[PDB]
Structure 1
């Protein structure tokens, strides 16, 4: 449950439904805004498709 990029427990955890992987929200959104793709699989991914995770 670490961010796939930062390697840390996310402050704001989200999941990409394409890679089924956890990210820090802003780090995933940076990739999505810049490329329109999931950074692990290169599949298309929109901001609206990201699943924000409700904290415990």
Structure 2
């Protein structure tokens, strides 16, 4: 019923119960600090939360993309080397074949 809030636990109380507890304990029921006996928007919040979730999504995607892309980046310079080995081996297998072709 009665309008009162503990200024240290920031919690909402019915004056009968909180004054009862303070008289015995001298203290707050939710954090046990002292307390003296006398002491559109839903749409905007949702749309803010729409923005909020997308930004957290955006970071996560950025994190996941960059993780994969780093591993990928190393492979590219190595990829050109990979073709070179097969090219080199195709020449070496040819050289070995021609030595076998000799006889």
Q: TM-score range by the shorter chain?
A: 0.5 to 0.7
> Could you tell me which residue of structure 2 aligns to residue 26 of structure 1?
16
- Using the TM superposition, give the Cα deviation of residue 12 of structure 1 relative to its aligned residue in structure 2, in angstroms: 1.2
Q: Which structure exhibits the higher relative contact order, with contacts defined as CA atoms closer than 8 Å and separated by 6 or more residues?
A: 1
Distance 1:17 1:46 in 2: 10
What is the Cα-based RMSD across aligned positions, in Å? 0.9
Give the number of aligned pairs: 39
In terms of fraction of residues, the more strand-rich structure is: 1
Q: TM-score, normalised by structure 2?
A: 0.36
Pair 1:17-2:7 in alignment: yes
Q: TM-score, normalised by structure 1?
A: 0.64
**Which structure has the larger Rg?**
2
Runs of 4+ with deviation above 3 angstroms: none
Specify every segment of 5 or more residues in structure 1 that has no aligned partner in the other structure, as ranges: 1-10, 51-56
